[PDB]
Amino acid sequence: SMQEEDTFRELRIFLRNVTHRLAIDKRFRVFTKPVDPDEVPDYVTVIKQPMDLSSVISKIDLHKYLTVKDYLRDIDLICSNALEYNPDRDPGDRLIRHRACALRDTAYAIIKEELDEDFEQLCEEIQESR
Ligand SMILES: CC1(C)CNC(=O)c2sc(N)nc2C1
Ligand SMILES: [Cl-]
């Protein structure tokens, strides 16, 4: 219905806002663009499901997220990919893992505080009815 299209549009507006606040954070600059296969040739082979904040933005506009759960799945994916690909004890790896976890935590914290549970519930029930 027209009412349901309004709900998903509100969701997309909310998700764009959250993602923008993550993307401008200097700690998360590394997660703002896809991995360059030139600088990093073995990434695409090791990480089967690449994800970054620019791709998240693209998926929002393509109406790929009907719930915040769908959205958070991709956020978690950005984090889990970073932990998997950079697992060593060296400072370089430990820094990006720390930043990855901070990205995940920040996203969840923003949503915990600003997302209405009834709004999310409505999104889920509309989604489950399709
Ligand atoms: C450090 C880098 C070159 C490779 N290792 C990574 O974890 C990622 S994930 C991403 N979106 N960019 C990079 C850049
Ligand atoms: Cl909301």
From Swiss-Prot:
It is found in: Nucleus. Induction: Up-regulated in breast, uterus, colon, ovary, and stomach tumors. Induced in breast cancer cells overexpressing NCOA3 or treated with estrogen. Down-regulated in 5-fluorouracil-resistant derivatives of the colon cancer cell line HCT 116. Transmembrane segments: none annotated. Residues 108-130 form a coiled coil. Highly expressed in estrogen receptor positive breast tumors and in osteosarcoma tumors. Residues 3-114 form the Bromo domain. May be a transcriptional coactivator of the nuclear receptor ESR1 required to induce the expression of a subset of estradiol target genes, such as CCND1, MYC and E2F1. May play a role in the recruitment or occupancy of CREBBP at some ESR1 target gene promoters. May be required for histone hyperacetylation. Involved in the estrogen-induced cell proliferation and cell cycle progression of breast cancer cells. Belongs to the AAA ATPase family. Interacts with ESR1 and NCOA3 and these interactions are enhanced by estradiol. Interacts with acetylated lysine residues on histone H1.4, H2A, H2B and H3 (in vitro). This is ATPase family AAA domain-containing protein 2. It comes from Homo sapiens (Human). The lineage of its organism: Eukaryota, Metazoa, Chordata, Craniata, Vertebrata.
